[PDB]
PDB file of C-alpha atoms in Angstrom:
ATOM      1  CA  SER A   1     -10.062  19.729 -30.748  1.00  0.00           C
ATOM      2  CA  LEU A   2     -13.102  17.586 -31.178  1.00  0.00           C
ATOM      3  CA  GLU A   3     -12.691  16.055 -27.611  1.00  0.00           C
ATOM      4  CA  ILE A   4     -12.054  19.554 -26.220  1.00  0.00           C
ATOM      5  CA  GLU A   5     -15.372  20.763 -27.808  1.00  0.00           C
ATOM      6  CA  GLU A   6     -17.253  17.813 -26.382  1.00  0.00           C
ATOM      7  CA  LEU A   7     -15.798  18.791 -22.848  1.00  0.00           C
ATOM      8  CA  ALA A   8     -16.803  22.217 -23.355  1.00  0.00           C
ATOM      9  CA  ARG A   9     -20.398  21.333 -24.504  1.00  0.00           C
ATOM     10  CA  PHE A  10     -20.545  18.703 -21.550  1.00  0.00           C
ATOM     11  CA  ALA A  11     -19.556  21.667 -19.156  1.00  0.00           C
ATOM     12  CA  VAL A  12     -22.411  24.075 -20.730  1.00  0.00           C
ATOM     13  CA  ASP A  13     -25.144  21.249 -20.390  1.00  0.00           C
ATOM     14  CA  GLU A  14     -23.889  20.159 -16.684  1.00  0.00           C
ATOM     15  CA  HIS A  15     -24.119  23.822 -15.801  1.00  0.00           C
ATOM     16  CA  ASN A  16     -27.606  24.199 -17.424  1.00  0.00           C
ATOM     17  CA  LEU A  17     -26.626  29.021 -21.708  1.00  0.00           C
ATOM     18  CA  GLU A  18     -25.811  28.265 -25.583  1.00  0.00           C
ATOM     19  CA  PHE A  19     -22.472  26.835 -26.177  1.00  0.00           C
ATOM     20  CA  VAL A  20     -20.768  29.143 -28.866  1.00  0.00           C
ATOM     21  CA  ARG A  21     -16.994  28.192 -29.094  1.00  0.00           C
ATOM     22  CA  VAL A  22     -13.891  27.202 -27.071  1.00  0.00           C
ATOM     23  CA  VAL A  23     -11.604  30.405 -26.388  1.00  0.00           C
ATOM     24  CA  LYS A  24      -9.093  28.287 -24.444  1.00  0.00           C
ATOM     25  CA  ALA A  25      -8.183  24.823 -23.064  1.00  0.00           C
ATOM     26  CA  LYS A  26      -5.396  23.631 -20.877  1.00  0.00           C
ATOM     27  CA  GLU A  27      -4.975  20.113 -18.911  1.00  0.00           C
ATOM     28  CA  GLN A  28      -3.104  20.190 -15.657  1.00  0.00           C
ATOM     29  CA  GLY A  29      -2.575  17.883 -12.436  1.00  0.00           C
ATOM     30  CA  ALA A  30      -2.226  14.242 -14.137  1.00  0.00           C
ATOM     31  CA  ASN A  31       0.126  11.772 -12.495  1.00  0.00           C
ATOM     32  CA  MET A  32       2.944  10.662 -15.164  1.00  0.00           C
ATOM     33  CA  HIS A  33       1.147   7.683 -16.724  1.00  0.00           C
ATOM     34  CA  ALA A  34      -0.905   7.003 -19.695  1.00  0.00           C
ATOM     35  CA  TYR A  35      -4.688   7.362 -18.886  1.00  0.00           C
ATOM     36  CA  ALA A  36      -4.005   9.128 -15.924  1.00  0.00           C
ATOM     37  CA  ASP A  37      -7.158  11.382 -14.494  1.00  0.00           C
ATOM     38  CA  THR A  38      -6.709  15.029 -15.605  1.00  0.00           C
ATOM     39  CA  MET A  39      -8.364  18.414 -15.009  1.00  0.00           C
ATOM     40  CA  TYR A  40      -9.239  20.292 -18.190  1.00  0.00           C
ATOM     41  CA  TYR A  41      -9.264  24.332 -17.709  1.00  0.00           C
ATOM     42  CA  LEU A  42     -11.575  25.595 -20.592  1.00  0.00           C
ATOM     43  CA  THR A  43     -12.354  29.271 -21.430  1.00  0.00           C
ATOM     44  CA  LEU A  44     -15.733  29.136 -23.736  1.00  0.00           C
ATOM     45  CA  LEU A  45     -16.851  34.344 -21.571  1.00  0.00           C
ATOM     46  CA  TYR A  46     -16.874  31.661 -18.881  1.00  0.00           C
ATOM     47  CA  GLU A  47     -14.181  29.439 -17.196  1.00  0.00           C
ATOM     48  CA  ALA A  48     -15.003  25.721 -16.588  1.00  0.00           C
ATOM     49  CA  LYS A  49     -13.292  22.885 -14.805  1.00  0.00           C
ATOM     50  CA  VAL A  50     -13.791  19.461 -16.378  1.00  0.00           C
ATOM     51  CA  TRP A  51     -12.632  16.143 -14.939  1.00  0.00           C
ATOM     52  CA  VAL A  52     -11.506  13.534 -17.402  1.00  0.00           C
ATOM     53  CA  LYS A  53     -11.274  10.168 -15.228  1.00  0.00           C
ATOM     54  CA  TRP A  54     -10.503   6.604 -16.149  1.00  0.00           C
ATOM     55  CA  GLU A  55     -11.548   3.476 -14.323  1.00  0.00           C
ATOM     56  CA  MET A  56     -11.404  -0.319 -15.131  1.00  0.00           C
ATOM     57  CA  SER A  57     -14.608  -2.241 -15.011  1.00  0.00           C
ATOM     58  CA  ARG A  58     -14.432  -6.193 -15.525  1.00  0.00           C
ATOM     59  CA  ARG A  59     -10.964  -5.630 -17.041  1.00  0.00           C
ATOM     60  CA  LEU A  60     -12.216  -2.950 -19.606  1.00  0.00           C
ATOM     61  CA  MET A  61     -10.934   0.645 -19.498  1.00  0.00           C
ATOM     62  CA  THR A  62     -13.686   3.072 -19.066  1.00  0.00           C
ATOM     63  CA  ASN A  63     -13.549   6.948 -19.314  1.00  0.00           C
ATOM     64  CA  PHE A  64     -16.072   9.398 -17.865  1.00  0.00           C
ATOM     65  CA  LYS A  65     -16.278  13.341 -17.343  1.00  0.00           C
ATOM     66  CA  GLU A  66     -17.272  15.421 -14.334  1.00  0.00           C
ATOM     67  CA  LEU A  67     -17.983  19.181 -14.023  1.00  0.00           C
ATOM     68  CA  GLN A  68     -15.812  20.611 -11.130  1.00  0.00           C
TER      69      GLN A  68
ATOM     70  CA  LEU B   1      -8.915  12.657  36.223  1.00  0.00           C
ATOM     71  CA  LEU B   2     -12.009  14.147  34.345  1.00  0.00           C
ATOM     72  CA  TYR B   3     -11.660  11.318  31.809  1.00  0.00           C
ATOM     73  CA  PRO B   4      -9.979   8.175  33.650  1.00  0.00           C
ATOM     74  CA  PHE B   5      -9.617   6.231  30.224  1.00  0.00           C
ATOM     75  CA  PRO B   6      -9.449   9.108  27.651  1.00  0.00           C
ATOM     76  CA  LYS B   7     -10.415   7.955  24.244  1.00  0.00           C
ATOM     77  CA  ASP B   8      -8.372  10.670  22.254  1.00  0.00           C
ATOM     78  CA  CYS B   9      -5.844  13.283  22.660  1.00  0.00           C
ATOM     79  CA  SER B  10      -8.791  16.020  23.141  1.00  0.00           C
ATOM     80  CA  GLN B  11      -9.841  14.119  26.469  1.00  0.00           C
ATOM     81  CA  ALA B  12      -6.091  13.785  27.481  1.00  0.00           C
ATOM     82  CA  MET B  13      -5.868  17.688  26.999  1.00  0.00           C
ATOM     83  CA  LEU B  14      -9.224  18.322  28.930  1.00  0.00           C
ATOM     84  CA  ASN B  15      -7.614  16.217  31.599  1.00  0.00           C
ATOM     85  CA  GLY B  16      -4.900  19.022  31.986  1.00  0.00           C
ATOM     86  CA  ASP B  17      -2.105  17.362  29.934  1.00  0.00           C
ATOM     87  CA  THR B  18      -0.774  20.304  27.582  1.00  0.00           C
ATOM     88  CA  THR B  19       2.586  18.933  26.513  1.00  0.00           C
ATOM     89  CA  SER B  20       3.042  17.266  23.003  1.00  0.00           C
ATOM     90  CA  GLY B  21       4.264  13.596  23.494  1.00  0.00           C
ATOM     91  CA  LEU B  22       3.250  10.085  23.901  1.00  0.00           C
ATOM     92  CA  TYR B  23       0.009   9.253  25.990  1.00  0.00           C
ATOM     93  CA  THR B  24      -2.139   6.188  26.451  1.00  0.00           C
ATOM     94  CA  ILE B  25      -5.617   6.375  25.031  1.00  0.00           C
ATOM     95  CA  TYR B  26      -8.301   3.812  25.563  1.00  0.00           C
ATOM     96  CA  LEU B  27     -10.773   2.956  22.417  1.00  0.00           C
ATOM     97  CA  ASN B  28     -14.469   3.781  23.576  1.00  0.00           C
ATOM     98  CA  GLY B  29     -12.698   4.400  27.084  1.00  0.00           C
ATOM     99  CA  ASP B  30     -12.261   0.677  27.761  1.00  0.00           C
ATOM    100  CA  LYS B  31      -9.359  -0.086  30.037  1.00  0.00           C
ATOM    101  CA  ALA B  32      -8.762  -3.332  28.020  1.00  0.00           C
ATOM    102  CA  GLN B  33      -8.164  -1.346  24.632  1.00  0.00           C
ATOM    103  CA  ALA B  34      -5.147   0.705  25.586  1.00  0.00           C
ATOM    104  CA  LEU B  35      -3.221   2.416  22.520  1.00  0.00           C
ATOM    105  CA  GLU B  36      -0.106   4.595  23.043  1.00  0.00           C
ATOM    106  CA  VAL B  37      -0.448   7.579  20.465  1.00  0.00           C
ATOM    107  CA  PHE B  38       1.543  10.831  19.811  1.00  0.00           C
ATOM    108  CA  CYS B  39      -0.526  13.743  20.936  1.00  0.00           C
ATOM    109  CA  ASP B  40       0.112  17.152  19.373  1.00  0.00           C
ATOM    110  CA  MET B  41      -1.106  19.546  22.016  1.00  0.00           C
ATOM    111  CA  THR B  42       0.151  22.818  20.504  1.00  0.00           C
ATOM    112  CA  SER B  43      -0.930  23.032  16.630  1.00  0.00           C
ATOM    113  CA  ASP B  44      -4.330  24.979  16.206  1.00  0.00           C
ATOM    114  CA  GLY B  45      -5.772  24.472  19.707  1.00  0.00           C
ATOM    115  CA  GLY B  46      -4.267  20.976  20.417  1.00  0.00           C
ATOM    116  CA  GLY B  47      -5.905  17.698  21.539  1.00  0.00           C
ATOM    117  CA  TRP B  48      -4.632  16.116  18.043  1.00  0.00           C
ATOM    118  CA  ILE B  49      -3.795  12.231  17.588  1.00  0.00           C
ATOM    119  CA  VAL B  50      -0.979  12.302  15.152  1.00  0.00           C
ATOM    120  CA  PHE B  51      -1.393   9.368  12.642  1.00  0.00           C
ATOM    121  CA  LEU B  52       1.378  10.119  10.069  1.00  0.00           C
ATOM    122  CA  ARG B  53       4.730  11.709  10.615  1.00  0.00           C
ATOM    123  CA  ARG B  54       7.285  12.423   7.714  1.00  0.00           C
ATOM    124  CA  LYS B  55      10.444  14.516   8.680  1.00  0.00           C
ATOM    125  CA  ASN B  56      13.748  12.974   7.762  1.00  0.00           C
ATOM    126  CA  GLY B  57      13.363   9.685   5.382  1.00  0.00           C
ATOM    127  CA  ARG B  58      14.825   7.099   8.198  1.00  0.00           C
ATOM    128  CA  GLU B  59      11.433   4.964   8.210  1.00  0.00           C
ATOM    129  CA  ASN B  60      10.315   2.819   5.280  1.00  0.00           C
ATOM    130  CA  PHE B  61       6.841   3.833   4.123  1.00  0.00           C
ATOM    131  CA  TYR B  62       6.915   1.603   1.110  1.00  0.00           C
ATOM    132  CA  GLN B  63       5.011  -1.367   3.117  1.00  0.00           C
ATOM    133  CA  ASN B  64       2.333  -4.032   2.411  1.00  0.00           C
ATOM    134  CA  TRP B  65      -1.356  -4.336   3.368  1.00  0.00           C
ATOM    135  CA  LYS B  66      -0.594  -5.899   6.665  1.00  0.00           C
ATOM    136  CA  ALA B  67       1.872  -3.240   7.726  1.00  0.00           C
ATOM    137  CA  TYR B  68      -0.506  -0.232   6.715  1.00  0.00           C
ATOM    138  CA  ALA B  69      -3.420  -2.340   8.511  1.00  0.00           C
ATOM    139  CA  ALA B  70      -1.451  -2.689  12.026  1.00  0.00           C
ATOM    140  CA  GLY B  71       0.736   0.454  11.959  1.00  0.00           C
ATOM    141  CA  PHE B  72       4.656   0.652  11.940  1.00  0.00           C
ATOM    142  CA  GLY B  73       7.375   3.022  13.184  1.00  0.00           C
ATOM    143  CA  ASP B  74       8.398   4.780  16.444  1.00  0.00           C
ATOM    144  CA  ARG B  75       5.385   7.271  17.274  1.00  0.00           C
ATOM    145  CA  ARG B  76       8.135   9.687  18.708  1.00  0.00           C
ATOM    146  CA  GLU B  77       9.674   9.849  15.177  1.00  0.00           C
ATOM    147  CA  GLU B  78       8.351   8.805  11.491  1.00  0.00           C
ATOM    148  CA  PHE B  79       5.446   6.439  11.651  1.00  0.00           C
ATOM    149  CA  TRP B  80       2.038   5.338  10.495  1.00  0.00           C
ATOM    150  CA  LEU B  81      -0.649   4.718  13.216  1.00  0.00           C
ATOM    151  CA  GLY B  82      -2.627   1.951  11.308  1.00  0.00           C
ATOM    152  CA  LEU B  83      -5.842   1.606   9.417  1.00  0.00           C
ATOM    153  CA  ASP B  84      -7.643  -0.484  11.915  1.00  0.00           C
ATOM    154  CA  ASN B  85      -6.785   2.202  14.697  1.00  0.00           C
ATOM    155  CA  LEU B  86      -7.960   4.948  12.425  1.00  0.00           C
ATOM    156  CA  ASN B  87     -11.162   2.954  11.565  1.00  0.00           C
ATOM    157  CA  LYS B  88     -11.914   2.425  15.531  1.00  0.00           C
ATOM    158  CA  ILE B  89     -11.003   5.970  16.642  1.00  0.00           C
ATOM    159  CA  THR B  90     -13.032   7.780  13.788  1.00  0.00           C
ATOM    160  CA  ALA B  91     -15.942   5.481  14.788  1.00  0.00           C
ATOM    161  CA  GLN B  92     -15.951   6.990  18.463  1.00  0.00           C
ATOM    162  CA  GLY B  93     -17.575  10.247  17.099  1.00  0.00           C
ATOM    163  CA  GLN B  94     -17.275  13.066  14.442  1.00  0.00           C
ATOM    164  CA  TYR B  95     -13.588  13.735  13.852  1.00  0.00           C
ATOM    165  CA  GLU B  96     -11.872  16.505  11.893  1.00  0.00           C
ATOM    166  CA  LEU B  97      -8.476  16.060   9.900  1.00  0.00           C
ATOM    167  CA  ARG B  98      -5.546  18.650  10.241  1.00  0.00           C
ATOM    168  CA  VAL B  99      -2.669  18.174   7.882  1.00  0.00           C
ATOM    169  CA  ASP B 100       0.633  20.369   8.642  1.00  0.00           C
ATOM    170  CA  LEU B 101       3.328  20.717   5.841  1.00  0.00           C
ATOM    171  CA  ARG B 102       6.565  22.258   6.378  1.00  0.00           C
ATOM    172  CA  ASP B 103       9.320  22.596   3.574  1.00  0.00           C
ATOM    173  CA  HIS B 104      12.312  24.899   3.507  1.00  0.00           C
ATOM    174  CA  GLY B 105      10.910  27.470   6.026  1.00  0.00           C
ATOM    175  CA  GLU B 106       7.549  27.544   4.376  1.00  0.00           C
ATOM    176  CA  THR B 107       4.418  26.217   6.096  1.00  0.00           C
ATOM    177  CA  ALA B 108       0.870  25.330   4.924  1.00  0.00           C
ATOM    178  CA  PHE B 109      -1.980  23.291   6.499  1.00  0.00           C
ATOM    179  CA  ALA B 110      -5.375  21.878   5.606  1.00  0.00           C
ATOM    180  CA  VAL B 111      -8.267  21.081   7.769  1.00  0.00           C
ATOM    181  CA  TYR B 112     -11.249  18.759   6.683  1.00  0.00           C
ATOM    182  CA  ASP B 113     -14.295  19.235   9.106  1.00  0.00           C
ATOM    183  CA  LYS B 114     -15.209  15.435   8.468  1.00  0.00           C
ATOM    184  CA  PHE B 115     -12.799  12.479   8.457  1.00  0.00           C
ATOM    185  CA  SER B 116     -13.493   8.844   8.772  1.00  0.00           C
ATOM    186  CA  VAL B 117     -11.979   5.472   7.862  1.00  0.00           C
ATOM    187  CA  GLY B 118     -14.131   2.315   7.486  1.00  0.00           C
ATOM    188  CA  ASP B 119     -13.540  -1.042   8.486  1.00  0.00           C
ATOM    189  CA  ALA B 120     -11.202  -3.736   6.684  1.00  0.00           C
ATOM    190  CA  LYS B 121     -14.355  -5.129   4.786  1.00  0.00           C
ATOM    191  CA  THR B 122     -14.583  -1.716   2.955  1.00  0.00           C
ATOM    192  CA  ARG B 123     -10.752  -1.679   2.393  1.00  0.00           C
ATOM    193  CA  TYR B 124     -10.495   1.197   4.994  1.00  0.00           C
ATOM    194  CA  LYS B 125     -12.795   3.491   2.652  1.00  0.00           C
ATOM    195  CA  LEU B 126     -11.989   7.171   3.118  1.00  0.00           C
ATOM    196  CA  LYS B 127     -14.556   9.796   3.894  1.00  0.00           C
ATOM    197  CA  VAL B 128     -13.062  13.404   3.828  1.00  0.00           C
ATOM    198  CA  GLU B 129     -15.188  16.450   3.399  1.00  0.00           C
ATOM    199  CA  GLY B 130     -15.259  20.100   4.364  1.00  0.00           C
ATOM    200  CA  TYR B 131     -11.975  21.677   3.155  1.00  0.00           C
ATOM    201  CA  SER B 132     -10.315  25.017   4.563  1.00  0.00           C
ATOM    202  CA  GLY B 133      -6.875  26.250   4.925  1.00  0.00           C
ATOM    203  CA  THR B 134      -3.650  27.132   2.735  1.00  0.00           C
ATOM    204  CA  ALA B 135      -2.264  23.920   1.355  1.00  0.00           C
ATOM    205  CA  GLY B 136      -5.148  23.486  -1.335  1.00  0.00           C
ATOM    206  CA  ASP B 137      -7.836  20.921  -1.340  1.00  0.00           C
ATOM    207  CA  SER B 138      -5.905  18.014  -2.572  1.00  0.00           C
ATOM    208  CA  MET B 139      -7.768  15.288  -0.430  1.00  0.00           C
ATOM    209  CA  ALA B 140     -11.188  15.968  -2.211  1.00  0.00           C
ATOM    210  CA  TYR B 141      -9.902  13.733  -5.168  1.00  0.00           C
ATOM    211  CA  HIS B 142      -9.421  10.913  -2.774  1.00  0.00           C
ATOM    212  CA  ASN B 143     -12.861  11.082  -0.846  1.00  0.00           C
ATOM    213  CA  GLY B 144     -14.853   7.789  -1.318  1.00  0.00           C
ATOM    214  CA  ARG B 145     -11.585   5.847  -2.238  1.00  0.00           C
ATOM    215  CA  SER B 146     -10.542   2.408  -0.626  1.00  0.00           C
ATOM    216  CA  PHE B 147      -6.759   2.050   0.601  1.00  0.00           C
ATOM    217  CA  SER B 148      -4.184   0.278  -1.654  1.00  0.00           C
ATOM    218  CA  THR B 149      -0.724  -1.040  -1.351  1.00  0.00           C
ATOM    219  CA  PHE B 150       1.601  -2.294  -3.769  1.00  0.00           C
ATOM    220  CA  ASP B 151       0.595  -6.043  -2.909  1.00  0.00           C
ATOM    221  CA  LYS B 152      -3.273  -5.134  -2.797  1.00  0.00           C
ATOM    222  CA  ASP B 153      -4.508  -3.180  -6.066  1.00  0.00           C
ATOM    223  CA  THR B 154      -8.282  -2.320  -6.897  1.00  0.00           C
ATOM    224  CA  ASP B 155     -10.281  -3.650  -9.532  1.00  0.00           C
ATOM    225  CA  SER B 156     -10.806   0.158 -10.928  1.00  0.00           C
ATOM    226  CA  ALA B 157      -7.186   1.127 -11.039  1.00  0.00           C
ATOM    227  CA  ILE B 158      -5.562   1.654 -14.452  1.00  0.00           C
ATOM    228  CA  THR B 159      -1.985   0.971 -13.096  1.00  0.00           C
ATOM    229  CA  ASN B 160      -0.967  -0.082  -9.692  1.00  0.00           C
ATOM    230  CA  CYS B 161      -0.668   3.232  -8.041  1.00  0.00           C
ATOM    231  CA  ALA B 162       1.236   2.147  -4.976  1.00  0.00           C
ATOM    232  CA  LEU B 163       3.864   0.243  -7.203  1.00  0.00           C
ATOM    233  CA  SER B 164       4.238   3.136  -9.672  1.00  0.00           C
ATOM    234  CA  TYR B 165       4.237   6.066  -7.029  1.00  0.00           C
ATOM    235  CA  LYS B 166       6.350   4.152  -4.364  1.00  0.00           C
ATOM    236  CA  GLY B 167       3.926   4.490  -1.501  1.00  0.00           C
ATOM    237  CA  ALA B 168       0.334   3.591  -0.044  1.00  0.00           C
ATOM    238  CA  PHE B 169      -2.871   5.578  -0.058  1.00  0.00           C
ATOM    239  CA  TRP B 170      -6.450   5.818  -0.734  1.00  0.00           C
ATOM    240  CA  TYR B 171      -5.533   6.040  -4.420  1.00  0.00           C
ATOM    241  CA  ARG B 172      -7.732   6.812  -7.372  1.00  0.00           C
ATOM    242  CA  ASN B 173      -5.843   7.202 -10.785  1.00  0.00           C
ATOM    243  CA  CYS B 174      -3.639   8.018  -8.987  1.00  0.00           C
ATOM    244  CA  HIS B 175      -3.151  10.955  -6.403  1.00  0.00           C
ATOM    245  CA  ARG B 176      -3.195  14.531  -5.626  1.00  0.00           C
ATOM    246  CA  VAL B 177      -1.880  13.511  -2.027  1.00  0.00           C
ATOM    247  CA  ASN B 178       1.050  11.072  -1.596  1.00  0.00           C
ATOM    248  CA  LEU B 179       2.093  11.753   1.873  1.00  0.00           C
ATOM    249  CA  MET B 180       3.345   8.087   2.318  1.00  0.00           C
ATOM    250  CA  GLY B 181       5.416   8.431  -0.824  1.00  0.00           C
ATOM    251  CA  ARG B 182       9.086   7.918  -1.085  1.00  0.00           C
ATOM    252  CA  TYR B 183      11.275  10.539   1.033  1.00  0.00           C
ATOM    253  CA  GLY B 184      13.315  13.051  -1.165  1.00  0.00           C
ATOM    254  CA  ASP B 185      11.889  11.733  -4.190  1.00  0.00           C
ATOM    255  CA  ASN B 186      11.301  14.739  -6.672  1.00  0.00           C
ATOM    256  CA  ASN B 187      10.339  12.313  -9.449  1.00  0.00           C
ATOM    257  CA  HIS B 188       6.884  13.062 -10.928  1.00  0.00           C
ATOM    258  CA  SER B 189       4.289  11.894  -8.441  1.00  0.00           C
ATOM    259  CA  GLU B 190       6.730   9.528  -6.467  1.00  0.00           C
ATOM    260  CA  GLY B 191       7.457  11.693  -3.436  1.00  0.00           C
ATOM    261  CA  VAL B 192       5.831  13.193  -0.339  1.00  0.00           C
ATOM    262  CA  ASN B 193       3.302  15.016  -2.561  1.00  0.00           C
ATOM    263  CA  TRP B 194       0.704  17.588  -1.881  1.00  0.00           C
ATOM    264  CA  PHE B 195      -0.137  18.655  -5.307  1.00  0.00           C
ATOM    265  CA  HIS B 196      -2.194  21.828  -4.743  1.00  0.00           C
ATOM    266  CA  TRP B 197       0.838  23.357  -2.569  1.00  0.00           C
ATOM    267  CA  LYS B 198       4.013  22.073  -4.236  1.00  0.00           C
ATOM    268  CA  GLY B 199       2.918  20.047  -7.134  1.00  0.00           C
ATOM    269  CA  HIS B 200       3.992  16.529  -8.293  1.00  0.00           C
ATOM    270  CA  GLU B 201       7.768  17.149  -8.692  1.00  0.00           C
ATOM    271  CA  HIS B 202       8.417  18.490  -5.275  1.00  0.00           C
ATOM    272  CA  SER B 203       8.947  16.070  -2.253  1.00  0.00           C
ATOM    273  CA  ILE B 204       7.886  17.751   1.095  1.00  0.00           C
ATOM    274  CA  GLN B 205      10.293  17.749   3.842  1.00  0.00           C
ATOM    275  CA  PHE B 206       7.849  17.658   6.847  1.00  0.00           C
ATOM    276  CA  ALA B 207       4.243  16.337   6.833  1.00  0.00           C
ATOM    277  CA  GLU B 208       1.818  15.423   9.746  1.00  0.00           C
ATOM    278  CA  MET B 209      -1.626  14.190   9.471  1.00  0.00           C
ATOM    279  CA  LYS B 210      -3.653  14.239  12.921  1.00  0.00           C
ATOM    280  CA  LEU B 211      -7.228  13.987  14.068  1.00  0.00           C
ATOM    281  CA  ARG B 212      -9.511  15.046  17.006  1.00  0.00           C
ATOM    282  CA  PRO B 213     -13.480  15.662  17.541  1.00  0.00           C
ATOM    283  CA  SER B 214     -14.650  18.435  15.349  1.00  0.00           C
ATOM    284  CA  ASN B 215     -16.820  19.823  18.599  1.00  0.00           C
ATOM    285  CA  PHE B 216     -13.445  20.659  20.085  1.00  0.00           C
ATOM    286  CA  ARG B 217     -13.390  23.914  17.919  1.00  0.00           C
ATOM    287  CA  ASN B 218     -16.274  25.288  20.070  1.00  0.00           C
TER     288      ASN B 218
END
């Protein structure tokens, strides 16, 4: 829920509106492995699509977001 | 002939060859650089070099880097044209990509207005942009990725995508397209997948990827 709110705030920031709350959140599209890239479908009324992606950098696992 | 050494299937078609089948093309119209390719002359205006065909599972697509660089298979049947060939063809001008999918009497397709493959030094880096069609935009996820096989992973991969998902592709983490995946494999993400058409738990019966100059549209 804290992570979902950070995604929703990130989406509003990337679009820029003043974030009030998350109405609905669903994840879809990940391959069947731990730390697979996934799309969040957020209702906040607005509908946002936010990538949560993972990449290795110098044998460290990194996590980043993109507004779709 | 209008083009005595046709450099792709669109020049072969402009020469008056209108029947799908095997044709000799010549990279950069060089007589010394003959390549026998399968031309799809009937789909969506014709003039297409086919570079992937899946239709029955008879051919092995779970192959190493060298096989994907060189190409493998009977070009009349299931095959992969080879990444060196794709690099050299896409370097000749501005090519578009078409993907034809068929499954249990249903059909869909995707077109990408810009399609190119980098050289071996780039690990055959994919450029794929400008989606239209009915299959859904599953290649966008793969734009900018290097190629990977079970025996050559990337320094950015979380898991070995080719090993895990029984194929070879321009993987990220890992795919929304797996058209060189394992035939008939409905296990999550392991099969002949086009995510935005049939998802990760449905291996598609028939798939072709093909390319031609984008100016052929006009």
